[PDB]
Symmetry: D2
Subunit: 249 residues, 4 copies
């Protein structure tokens, strides 16, 4: 029987690449999405065309709220409902925007930025564990988490919190044989709204090839961590950044 | 005289920080949540030394719809009492386990992430907005990358606080506001902890096989806010007697 | 045409497993050794039985000395003489023994421990680059920041190796040479160590209460040299079953 | 009786400022130097004029060689010979120059860069401990050690090794009450001879004030670490870098 994976924020970009690569490796996949319904359904259709009944979509807002635990429990439930098992969880979904220190309320910003990047991964981890082979969790971290961008304090706090979860959960879930690791991009796919000139500004900072990571390159590290080739690895965060984090001012 | 806000200052480490700042010549806002009696008792002692140099301020620092207003009011209380706010010490902290496998989990999120991360963020915002030797000191955790079993939310909150310390150091540098951390390993043990368990944890510390006193933690805070640290920002000083260096 | 790799200290244990997995992946290999001639030759014979003319041995002391640069240049040269190319360098050879702060002279200990763990990797890196999916993998130490009592020189060597890995990643990126590390926690324990002592160390590992096999360490090396890691440079992957996360 | 301190490379720049501040705090000082004889003697004169018999010079090359242990032992011996005690050791002396990967031989570069930055501090630590209150050692580290500069691999390796020594010696010497800490500058006052354009280039990178640290600001952190206000601090490395290490590419 084929193993099954949940990938959050899987409709496009890095999340899609991860879902595709897992699917190509033989996983059945839950494609979680928030707003990108057309893209999610389009991906599920492609994957099911390749192998029937091996992909489903699952909609959920991962903003923090008093119902977030129920929503996270339901994402895990959706994997068991579809495939009867859940072997891998990839925490990929992420809100990302600036929150300067000097029309959303600050509390909405906290709920969205900390909810998606940290609290939802935490609750999904709880639900994944509670429900339980080669079991693992992979968290999409940030290679630049200790060289923060100006005006992004809440996002940065969320990604730092995610490092803490990765390490705490690796230790706490080790007795159950659930490995917990991270993949940390530096610069990969740039924002859709970013102009080419600005994209090039950021690309030129990367020592290895002066280019951003392809979505496939990020997915490659995820696939490694979930594989039997990483069976002794837990609590590790692999930078996939072309050396970007090593570059001084 | 300069003025400082210390959160969770009624007892233990926060109290020692408030006392040392006061002894150094600061006027102090003693923030508290439940420890009203102790907060006022401290204010009384400091005011006995120098009249009208200490005030108290009550606030719950749990995350909620009203937290930003609460944090704005803490900073405001310093300006009201003293006409200035030079130093913010984020010391208040909720601390208890949250296993992965009668508070709901979301209440625990609100308390643990609120006190340790969101409130420091909002207080930092309010401190900066209102603005010499200005600085913020965040009480971090030397053991943040060697987590205790079953403490994921607390750990996530302290990791978030590292992110805030570094982010705010960079963002507030143009305003001349330094942002640093002090990271205890083991200092004052929980009051509910048995003496036998206290000894177990004490014996792990290479330097002297004992916990830090509150005063020793306060000493590093005093250094960071002082003129002797005026080029230091974004630094987190471990005050842990080597604890973080000890392998399993 | 098949790529070629140099693996230092490849006769036994982790180096041997790396050389075997590289060969299984399709590499021709230079098996470097110091004292273990018989084991190096038996490995070469094994690999050559699998595929003719795909393995050679190279003897060298990697202790620091005035002849070390020539020795390291000769190791890289041996790969070119055998195979016409050198795609991968694995810095695995390592002296390991305590050097307390309080019959070898201390300068000999410096030469051996710092030579094998840091200076030889540096010189081999120079020679590798000078001759140029190219990459270098350095065998680091997941416990490098939780040092063992009385192992300061070894620890210094491995800390220097982190610096090399990062410096070389940046400096060699323009040539498309990636430079990464694999960091074991506890792997292959010495056969002669008492099982009662082995078990003491095993019990410390969260994941499985067991040391890593040499093959498990080798698996991370294989990933790092593969097409699946072509954007990864300057990264050090812990393969430690969570050991480095465990507090005192 | 006044305590005594050894400061290596104390004739100029940061080491000089450390020596001056220790002396002002009440320490008797061994001013070690290599080439800067006139400056070392002039400093000793300045300090002795303030308080007679409280400063001596000690010349030594700290390049690695088979006699380096003897030279390091002799530096510590010189403190006991002058002052009858040795309470503080500051490892400040350091060779610094590029060593590209692609007139000195490479083994000479290894000897100088690794010797001064790592092996001499190790040997001095050994001798300091062996010859033994508020005892401590302070190592001058590099705030940028994990964001290396192009072509400085040996300097970087030396400073990385120094981090290892700081942590290793903190644990190993804890039972003897000797604390071992670090101070990590980013950029400190640049040579007046460096070009105006290049000085501006490096100064402008510093978030806090867009300027380098003074030598005195670096010394201030050393003074704190050796003081009674740091009695529980061991194995800590305090960055004094104006935020430099936090700045991304
Ligand atoms: N791209 C990079 O250069 C880079 C760098 C460092 C780290 N990372 C990390 O790598 C991961 C993938 O990066 P990416 O650029 O592909 O991500 P992304 O496009 O910015 O976001 C991924 C998905 O997150 C989902 N999401 C946003 N808010 C949500 C909410 N409130 N509830 C539920 N889902 C929500 C969105 O789903 P819908 O579209 O369905 O609404 C979105 O498609 C992220 O965790 C990111 O932080 C990326
Ligand atoms: N003690 C250690 O060994 C150690 C180790 C590592 C880090 N630290 C950190 O160092 C700091 C001081 O430690 P400590 O042991 O003195 O702290 P603590 O006693 O655990 O907590 C300090 C104060 O935080 C306040 N607090 C708790 N929940 C709050 C809430 N919801 N809203 C507002 N305030 C709240 C409390 O104020 P009231 O009493 O007025 O209710 C409490 O007295 C903390 O940030 C801690 O995380 C301590
Ligand atoms: N095993 C672990 O749990 C562990 C943990 C952390 C890090 N590591 C690192 O991982 C790597 C592999 O570990 P391991 O246990 O397999 O290593 P190892 O057995 O200690 O050493 C591997 C080889 O290094 C060679 N070597 C020693 N001194 C040399 C010298 N002066 N000149 C040239 N070669 C010399 C020896 O070759 P000959 O036999 O031919 O003389 C030896 O077989 C090492 O770099 C080690 O430091 C291992
Ligand atoms: N300045 C910065 O921005 C910065 C940044 C990061 C780290 N650091 C570190 O902080 C410390 C102080 O910085 P600095 O700029 O004042 O240092 P520096 O001027 O580069 O070096 C200090 C002294 O080291 C001595 N030295 C050099 N080679 C020696 C050898 N072979 N044997 C014995 N002594 C030798 C020299 O003494 P003589 O003059 O007597 O020959 C020199 O004056 C150094 O360890 C440095 O690496 C400084
Ligand atoms: N990795 C990362 N974290 C970020 C947080 C806020 C804004 C951008 C962020 N990035 C992408 C990034 C950061 C720094 C640099 Cl120099 C580059 Cl080229 C890309
Ligand atoms: N510093 C610290 N962070 C903690 C998080 C959860 C529970 C306890 C925590 N401590 C105190 C602590 C942690 C590990 C050890 Cl070995 C010791 Cl003596 C004290
Ligand atoms: N990884 C590692 N580095 C060491 C340096 C000196 C002696 C042993 C070393 N090890 C193996 C090790 C270190 C700490 C622990 Cl708790 C375990 Cl189980 C294994
Ligand atoms: N020793 C030395 N040579 C220098 C040349 C140009 C600028 C500064 C010089 N220094 C002092 C020094 C030594 C090490 C570092 Cl890392 C730094 Cl920023 C400065
Ligand atoms: N701190 C430091 N380490 C260095 C090593 C080699 C050359 C210069 C070094 N510096 C000074 C430095 C490094 C990076 C930046 Cl962006 C700056 Cl303004 C200064």
């Amino acid at each position: 029987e084929a193993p099954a994976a949940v990938v959050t924020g899987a409709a496009k970009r890095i999340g899609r690449a991860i879902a595709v690569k897992l699917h190509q490796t033989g996983y059945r996949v839950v494609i979680h999405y928030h707003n990108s319904a057309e893209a999610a359904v389009s991906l599920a259709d492609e994957l099911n065309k390749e192998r029937s009944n091996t992909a489903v979509v699952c909609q959920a807002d991962l903003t923090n709220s008093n119902v977030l635990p129920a929503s996270c429990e339901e994402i895990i439930n959706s994997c068991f409902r579809a495939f009867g098992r859940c072997d891998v969880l990839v925490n990929n979904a992420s809100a990302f925007y600036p929150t300067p220190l000097v029309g959303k309320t600050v509390e909405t910003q906290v709920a969205e930025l900390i909810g998606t990047n940290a609290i939802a991964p935490f609750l999904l981890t709880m639900s994944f564990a509670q429900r339980q082979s080669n079991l693992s969790i992979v968290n999409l971290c940030d290679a630049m988490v200790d060289q923060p961008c100006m005006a992004f304090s809440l996002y940065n706090m969320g990604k730092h919190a995610l490092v803490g979860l990765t390490q705490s959960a690796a230790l706490e879930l080790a007795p159950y044989g659930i490995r917990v690791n991270g993949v940390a991009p530096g610069v990969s796919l740039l924002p859709v709204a970013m102009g080419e000139e600005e994209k090039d500004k950021w690309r030129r900072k990367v020592p290895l090839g002066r280019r951003e990571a392809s979505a496939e390159q990020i997915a490659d590290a995820v696939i490694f961590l979930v594989s039997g080739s990483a069976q002794y690895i837990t609590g590790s965060i692999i930078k996939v950044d072309g050396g970007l984090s090593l570059v001084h001012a």
